[PDB]
């Protein structure tokens, strides 16, 4: 109950991982090659953590404990020819050599599970290497079939092997406006059932919203995927805020599923990060936490193309970094309640989890986010993505009228029954989304 293992699947997941370990090296003072250069704190390991994500080598080196699994060797080569070679163990970089699809056509079938044995053996050896195990971090793209298929397969495998560890999945969802490839909705929904049956906490991120805030908040005319990776890297690394730094009231990973999820039911909270400003707008804004919370409530900063204020209230967590005052945040949340926001349920009935962290918020030099003395990361399991899955499901109905793909899907061994079961599972999930707020 000490270490967290992170696995990235797909090119997008690998880029996100690269960005996030670059940050981790940045705040914790590890040079882009490690050992050291030099150690900083007190507390960064020792005392623990680290080790929480970086293995503490006996020689004094710091080694990230991650497994790069992919069937496209280009990403592994790009990782290995850069400064990342000194951070990842050679045996942890599982480079694939078979390319027949990208990738869900064969990824979620017999083609992938003769390699999964080696992956499970390696992760078991890594778990035996460390003392204890707390949870897993997942970073895969639901657009790319590699991420969907391989990540889902690992999900059922590691839910079977332990079944007692927290499962955090940062899945990149396809843009609801347009899809880069047609098969992405299949790659998402044919694994949504496995996610429902084999996940504990899933985080939804949309590239369209990140691009929107880059165009608007960052004033960037041509946003890049690297900027998105860096932004979601801060989002991930602020969660994950009190687990590596001292705080007055630290937040535990189990606490999330104790308070946000009181049922064997919906466990898919939203995330938001704020303030979001450029280096040129830092000379005019010194706002308090109330406006930061208001920015979090904005649809554009929710990483979902929907209105979070049109939904119904659900238990939420507020995490604070830097210089914050409890009276100020209590006043802010009381004002938010006074403004008659999303309809409060009668089961909590009003629960605002407040997290305070001493460390100042940090920003990436590769990104245009200005360093701020206080930041808010808000987690809420709001039912406002229900219309998002409804739009995806309408797309599903219209492209399932002809079924458009069942030729290959049946030819490899599947049949329309699985698609119908996924359809009715999604319908049941939407109905539960409506009912959980309709009961109150």
């Amino acid at each position: 109950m000490r270490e967290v293992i992170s696995i990235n699947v797909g090119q997008a997941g690998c880029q996100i991982g690269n960005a996030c370990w670059e940050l981790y090296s940045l705040e914790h003072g590890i040079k882009p090659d490690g050992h050291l250069e030099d150690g900083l704190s007190k507390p960064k390991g020792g005392e623990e953590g680290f080790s929480t994500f970086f293995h503490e080598t006996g020689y004094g080196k710091f080694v990230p404990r991650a497994i790069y699994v992919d069937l496209e060797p280009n990403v592994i080569d790009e990782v290995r020819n850069g400064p990342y070679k000194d951070l990842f163990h050679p045996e942890q970089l599982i480079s694939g050599k078979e390319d027949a699809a990208n990738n869900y056509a064969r990824g979620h079938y017999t083609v992938g599970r003769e390699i999964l044995g080696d992956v499970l053996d390696r992760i078991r050896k890594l778990a035996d290497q460390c003392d204890g195990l707390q949870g897993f971090l997942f970073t895969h793209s639901l657009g790319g079939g590699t991420g969907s298929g391989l990540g889902s397969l690992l999900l059922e495998e590691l839910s079977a092997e332990y079944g007692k560890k927290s499962k955090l999945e940062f899945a990149v969802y396809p843009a609801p406006q347009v899809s880069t490839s047609v098969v992405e909705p299949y790659n998402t929904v044919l694994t949504t059932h496995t996610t429902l049956e084999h996940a504990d906490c899933t985080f939804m991120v949309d590239n369209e919203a990140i691009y929107d805030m880059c165009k608007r908040n960052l004033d960037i005319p041509r946003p890049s995927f690297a900027n998105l990776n860096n932004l979601i890297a801060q989002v991930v690394s602020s969660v994950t805020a009190s687990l590596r730094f001292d705080g007055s009231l630290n937040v535990d990973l189990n606490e999330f599923q104790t308070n946000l999820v009181p049922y064997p039911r919906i466990h898919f909270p939203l995330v938001s990060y704020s303030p979001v400003l450029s280096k040129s707008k830092a000379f005019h804004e010194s706002n308090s936490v109330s406006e930061i919370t208001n920015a979090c409530f904005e649809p554009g900063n929710q990483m979902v193309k929907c209105d979070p204020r049109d939904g119904k209230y659900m238990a939420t967590c507020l995490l604070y970094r830097g210089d914050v005052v409890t009276r100020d945040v209590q006043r802010a949340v009381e004002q938010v309640k006074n403004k008659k926001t999303v309809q409060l349920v009668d089961w909590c009935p009003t629960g605002f989890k407040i997290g305070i962290c001493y460390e100042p918020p940090t920003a990436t030099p590769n990104s245009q986010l200005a360093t701020v003395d206080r930041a808010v990361c808000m987690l809420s399991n709001t039912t406002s993505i229900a219309e998002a899955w409804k739009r995806i499901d309408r797309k599903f109905d219209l492209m399932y009228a002809k079924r458009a793909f069942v030729h290959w899907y049946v030819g490899e061994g599947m049949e329309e029954g699985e698609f119908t079961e996924a359809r009715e599972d999604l319908a049941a999930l939407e109905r539960d989304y409506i009912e959980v707020g309709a009961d109150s």
């Binding site: 078979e98 390319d99 699809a101 490839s181 047609v182 041509r222 995927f225 492209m399 458009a404």
Partner: protein
């Protein structure tokens, strides 16, 4: 799983393959005397796809060129870069296929093709990551249509898990070099549809039109047309051999672009279509390439796109491009061109990103799509048969070897079935 073996056959196929070879050796950089010019790493592991390491640091192609006339190889080894070709790659015989289908592969074309199959096998165990098979031939040509289909038959027989890529040149229904050119074309497509997974529609008259429109070419030369088609052929695989946001593979084309293996006909479009004298006056950007993509006079099918409708379209972009430009332009085209897209996908789009810039240019792309305009060409050819071939004039030259009217009736039924498939899927 990247290596590609380039098979060349036919009179036009040899020229197309040769021009593709010079375009490849110029785009990655390799002098003909065996001098390394890659810069720096990505141009070294990716040349294993087409070349194999010989002794003393020499790179030689893995490509079997076959033709019944041996005069083309003389204009290859002594001409521009073909000196890397090992002498064993020259499989040639005597003297011709007769420019017909009855003698192309039915009786005399099945003799040396056993040795061709043997050398394909030996290259197969000589290869480690065999990915796909590239063939360039002529639909109406006697040699290309003759043993090309039978080579496809063997490559399916020995490789049931490997897809096949065909780039036959479709003769125009208005130009008749010989009276039996459409006859050979249809006798070839009789088995092409039953043995191929995807194909491209190439018309020389469309190339002439685009040369006289944008290039303003004064001398009709097949070399420039070969250069254009070879640039397109390189562009469709730059995504595989150069990583981007979304790498694309031929199997990905089969999964996404192809609706089902029966329907695999594609029209090809290329951009930018600019000539000398206009390079200092245009801004080469993603939107301009897009209006050049959907322009009705830029594809080489060549048919009318705005009188029918598309079933699915794809974009294969190359060079330093931001993710926002391409998606924003795709929103624009889906908003303004929504009528001609099918109402069941409903977003006909497949995107691929390439890192390196095209040779001789800054930004470029290729266009692959499915429309209902190919059935018009099919019915034109069928009407040509129903008009000319009802007199049974010069038809004995094929029935002398044992041809029956059942095969021709079955081919007519096949083209009827293709039209019906093109109407399912209504125009």
């Amino acid at each position: 799983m990247r290596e590609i073996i380039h098979i060349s056959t036919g009179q036009c196929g040899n020229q197309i393959g040769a021009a593709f070879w010079e375009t490849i050796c110029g785009e990655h950089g390799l002098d003909f005397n065996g001098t390394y010019h890659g810069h720096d790493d990505i141009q070294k592991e990716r040349l294993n796809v087409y070349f194999n390491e010989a002794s003393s640091g020499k790179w030689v192609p893995r490509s079997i060129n076959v033709d019944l006339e041996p005069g083309t190889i003389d204009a290859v080894r002594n001409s521009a870069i073909g000196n890397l070709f090992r002498p064993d790659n020259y499989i040639f015989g005597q003297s011709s296929a007769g420019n017909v289908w009855a003698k192309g592969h039915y009786t005399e074309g099945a003799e040396l093709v056993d040795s061709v199959m043997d050398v394909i096998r030996r290259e197969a165990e000589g290869c480690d990551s065999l990915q796909g098979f590239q063939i360039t031939h002529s639909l109406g040509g006697g040699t290309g249509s003759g043993m090309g289909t039978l080579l496809i038959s063997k490559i399916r027989e020995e490789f049931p898990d490997r897809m096949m890529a065909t780039f036959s040149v479709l003769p125009s229904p208005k130009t008749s070099d010989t009276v039996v050119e459409p006859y050979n074309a249809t006798l070839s497509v009789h088995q092409l549809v039953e043995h191929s997974d995807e194909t491209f529609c190439i018309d020389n008259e469309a190339l002439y039109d685009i040369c006289q429109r944008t290039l303003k070419l004064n001398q009709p030369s097949y070399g420039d047309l070969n250069n254009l088609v070879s640039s397109v052929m390189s562009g469709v695989t730059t995504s595989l051999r150069y990583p981007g946001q979304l790498n694309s593979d031929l199997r990905k084309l089969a999964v996404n672009l192809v609706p089902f293996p029966r329907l695999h006909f594609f029209m090809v479009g290329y951009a930018p279509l600019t000539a000398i004298g206009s390079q200092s006056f245009r801004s080469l950007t993603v939107p301009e390439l897009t209006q050049q993509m959907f322009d009705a006079k830029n594809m080489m099918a060549a048919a009318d796109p705005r009188n029918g409708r598309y079933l699915t379209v794809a974009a294969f972009f190359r060079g330093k491009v931001s993710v926002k430009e391409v998606e924003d332009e795709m929103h624009k085209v889906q908003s303004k061109n929504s009528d001609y897209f099918v109402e069941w996908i409903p977003n006909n789009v497949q995107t691929a990103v390439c890192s390196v810039a095209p040779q001789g240019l800054d930004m470029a792309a290729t266009f692959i799509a499915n429309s209902t305009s190919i059935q018009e060409l099919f019915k034109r050819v069928g009407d040509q048969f129903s008009a000319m071939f009802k007199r049974k004039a010069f038809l004995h030259w094929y029935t002398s070897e044992g041809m029956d009217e059942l095969e021709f009736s079955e081919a007519e039924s096949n083209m009827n079935d293709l039209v019906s498939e093109y109407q399912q899927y209504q125009e």
